[PDB]
Design a protein around this ligand. Structure first.
Ligand SMILES: [K+]
Ligand SMILES: [K+]
Ligand SMILES: [Mg+2]
Ligand SMILES: [Mg+2]
Ligand SMILES: [Mg+2]
Ligand SMILES: [Mg+2]
Ligand SMILES: [Mg+2]
Ligand SMILES: [Mg+2]
Ligand SMILES: [Mg+2]
Ligand SMILES: [Mg+2]
Ligand SMILES: [Mg+2]
Ligand SMILES: [Mg+2]
Ligand SMILES: [Mg+2]
Ligand SMILES: [Mg+2]
Ligand code: NA
Ligand code: NA
Ligand code: NA
Lengths: 153, 88, 187, 100
RNA sequence: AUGCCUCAGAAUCACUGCAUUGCAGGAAUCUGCGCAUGGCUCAUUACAUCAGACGUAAUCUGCCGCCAAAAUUUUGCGG
RNA sequence: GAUGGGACGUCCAGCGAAUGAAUGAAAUUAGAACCAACGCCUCCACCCGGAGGCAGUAAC
RNA sequence: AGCCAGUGAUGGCCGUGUAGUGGACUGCCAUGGCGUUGACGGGAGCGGGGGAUUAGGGUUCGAUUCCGGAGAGGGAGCCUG
């Protein structure tokens, strides 16, 4: 008689506005499984360029993250860096630290330096301080954020 | 009225210049349409329509080339499958 | 005037940046349109590189899409009922992107009758159209919330265009869990 | 490189609508000649086999462009030899017998 | 010290030279393009500017190159 | 009466722009049996009506 | 020797504005961000290619021809393109 009625998730819809992916329509039931995960839900995911694999959490998850490299319109291009997780206090953001040696020509010796960078982390990753991450350059996402986490080792 | 000569109704003003006979000044008439201008207007449309027709010909030749290559590939596949069937 | 540069901002260290050079035309901003709801009124703006932007002021109609049926109709907006930014926008009746509005449902009722033969003029149809209706209705199902709203005379939709940039108020009807999410808030 | 069409006794009718024509009205089109099997192929064309090779030559004549329930009835000659169809049929029957 | 006329946008100067109801040159104005380049100086300025390496899949782009174009019931006459 | 086949007529169907839907590939296993209608091949010389099976087979 | 948050400081959500990204900007939410590897403040100073002095390592100058930036007494606003 009538089509079945879905229900709100209540574990991801905890904001003032309805959270949704802009790439697919969750209300369309089509005969082709173009964008369908193992659970049968409609979910959009893609492969980023270089030799990086899309995590299974991204394909089979339920978060939204309109800033995610694997499930949104953010594109990775530029340079690739590695660092050490320094702090994970902000929401969906972490601070990584890069340590390097600088060469002083007059004394023929090295000295230690460091630099702090703030990056965006998708919910498919769960880094902790002391971990090692690989990040890739993207378009400006905030006042100080220019990188996205691609892999946690 | 329409289709009436206008080339001699234009007035001429006499300028009495010393040392020679008076010059007569008449304006140049604008928007005078002759047979050469009519042919010039009509050539533009026929040249334009030939350009779009020769572009349709170029598209047809490209489509024929694409179709011929796919026909050959299907024929080769059918021959392989046909040979496999009769070798059973 | 208004600028969009980072020169007036503090550094991450908290220090103050000493500004040399003046303000450039390439980084200007402009005053917001603040589109209201009413008889149509627009104002052209000459943007960079030529080209014209249209400022929406008091729009009242647009094209609204029925996503499930992949159609659209031209309908008149009746009122604004919700806004995720602040209640002040709902109170002042401001049309912006993602605003929740209601529409008159008359065009969508007419389309449903002429496509499926169900009336929420039908009996005067050709036999081959009647046969086509039976096929379409064979494996088509409407949902509770949509059928109730179409009978009532209004249904909810969200604005999909940016009225202050293009001067158009277009949107999509609400369906699925999105309809349930906003119905519970509107209670 | 001889033409493979003459001496065929098989004809081709281009605009024949099998959903509004039936075989009885198709056979009426040729009345003075004995008719072998008739085939229709859903792309609106048909094949008609005739007994004598001496036939179907004046049938191709005085019939190209004439009206047959509309559509102008384009008609030509086709190879489609009946003898080769019979051998294909008995080979298919033999092949199906081996399969089952 | 920034203006620009060719065979090829617009001359009835009551402008000039020859002819004798024309042929040329054409002051002035309208139109189109440029004046955001060049030249000068070094006051400001340390997550700024600059240099080496990279991006714009986050965008705009006249002049220049190679190209493209099948929308549109108009006009005359008799009503 | 047939999501039956052909005509006839009556509204749309150009580039660019706005909103919504579809396309923008696949690359982790091998054989069978029934019912719906779709395509072909054989009969009973054709037609009539009334039978029985997958030789081949990019799509239309 | 501590700096940053009324009035944006670091991040998140829906938007506005821009040619376009972005706390660039409005509303709401969390307590974050930087620092003895010298932040914050002060002094001198347009940056570079390069010049001077040459065992080697170094020290010092670069307003000035080329490249980049900024300005037209001071400082603000804008039209046409
Ligand atoms: K945003
Ligand atoms: K210009
Ligand atoms: Mg001249
Ligand atoms: Mg001018
Ligand atoms: Mg200059
Ligand atoms: Mg460089
Ligand atoms: Mg036309
Ligand atoms: Mg100075
Ligand atoms: Mg210098
Ligand atoms: Mg000085
Ligand atoms: Mg000098
Ligand atoms: Mg000097
Ligand atoms: Mg200047
Ligand atoms: Mg002075
Ligand atoms: Na003229
Ligand atoms: Na210096
Ligand atoms: Na310069």
């Amino acid at each position: 008689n009538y089509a079945r009625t879905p229900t709100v998730d209540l574990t991801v819809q905890h904001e003032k506005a309805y959270q949704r992916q802009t790439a697919v329509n969750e209300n369309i039931r089509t005969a082709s499984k173009k964008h369908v995960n193992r659970s049968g839900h409609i979910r959009y995911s893609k492969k980023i360029g270089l030799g990086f694999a899309t995590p299974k959490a991204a394909i089979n998850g339920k978060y939204i993250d309109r800033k995610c490299p694997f499930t949104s319109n953010v594109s990775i291009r530029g340079r690739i860096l590695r660092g050490v997780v320094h702090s994970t206090k902000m929401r969906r953001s972490i601070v990584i630290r890069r340590n390097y040696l600088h060469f002083i020509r007059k004394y023929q010796r090295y000295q230690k330096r460091h630099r702090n960078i703030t990056v965006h982390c998708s919910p498919c990753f769960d880094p902790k301080p002391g971990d090692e991450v690989v990040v890739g350059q993207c378009r400006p996402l905030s006042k100080t954020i220019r990188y996205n986490v691609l892999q946690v080792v | 009225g329409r289709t009436d000569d206008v080339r001699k109704y234009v007035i001429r003003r006499k300028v009495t210049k010393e040392g020679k006979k008076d010059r007569f000044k008449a304006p140049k008439i604008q928007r005078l349409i002759t047979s050469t201008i009519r042919a010039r207007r009509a050539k533009k449309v026929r040249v334009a329509i030939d350009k779009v027709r020769k572009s349709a010909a170029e598209r047809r030749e490209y489509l024929r080339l694409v179709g011929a290559r796919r026909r050959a590939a299907r024929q080769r596949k059918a021959a392989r499958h046909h040979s496999s069937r009769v070798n059973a | 005037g208004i600028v969009r540069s980072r020169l007036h901002k503090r550094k991450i260290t908290g220090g103050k940046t000493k500004i040399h050079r003046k303000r450039m035309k390439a980084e200007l901003g402009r005053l917001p349109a603040n589109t209201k709801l009413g008889p149509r009124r627009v104002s052209p703006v000459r943007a960079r590189g030529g080209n014209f932007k249209l400022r929406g002021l008091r729009l009242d109609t647009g094209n609204f899409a029925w996503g499930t049926e992949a159609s659209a109709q031209r309908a008149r907006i009746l009122d604004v009922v919700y806004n995720a930014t602040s209640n002040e926008l709902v109170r002042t009746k401001t049309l912006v992107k993602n605003c929740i509005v209601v529409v008159d449902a008359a065009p969508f009722r007419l389309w449903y009758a002429k496509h499926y033969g169900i009336d929420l003029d039908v009996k005067k149809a050709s036999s081959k159209l009647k046969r086509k209706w039976e096929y379409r209705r064979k494996h088509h199902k409407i949902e509770k919330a949509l059928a109730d709203q179409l009978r009532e005379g209004r249904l909810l939709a969200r604005i999909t265009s940016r009225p202050g940039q293009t001067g158009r108020a277009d949107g999509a009807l609400l369906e699925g869990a999105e309809l349930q999410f906003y119905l519970k808030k509107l209670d | 490189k001889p033409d493979p069409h003459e001496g065929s006794s098989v004809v081709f009718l281009s605009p024949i609508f099998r959903t509004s024509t039936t075989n009885g009205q198709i056979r009426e089109l040729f009345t003075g000649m004995r008719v072998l099997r008739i085939r229709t192929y859903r792309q609106n064309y048909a094949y008609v086999y005739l007994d004598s090779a001496a036939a179907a030559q004046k049938f191709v004549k005085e019939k190209n462009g004439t009206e047959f329930r509309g559509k102008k009835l384009r008609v030509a000659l086709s190879t489609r030899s009946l003898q080769k169809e019979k051998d294909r049929a008995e080979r298919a029957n033999l092949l199906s017998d081996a399969h089952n």
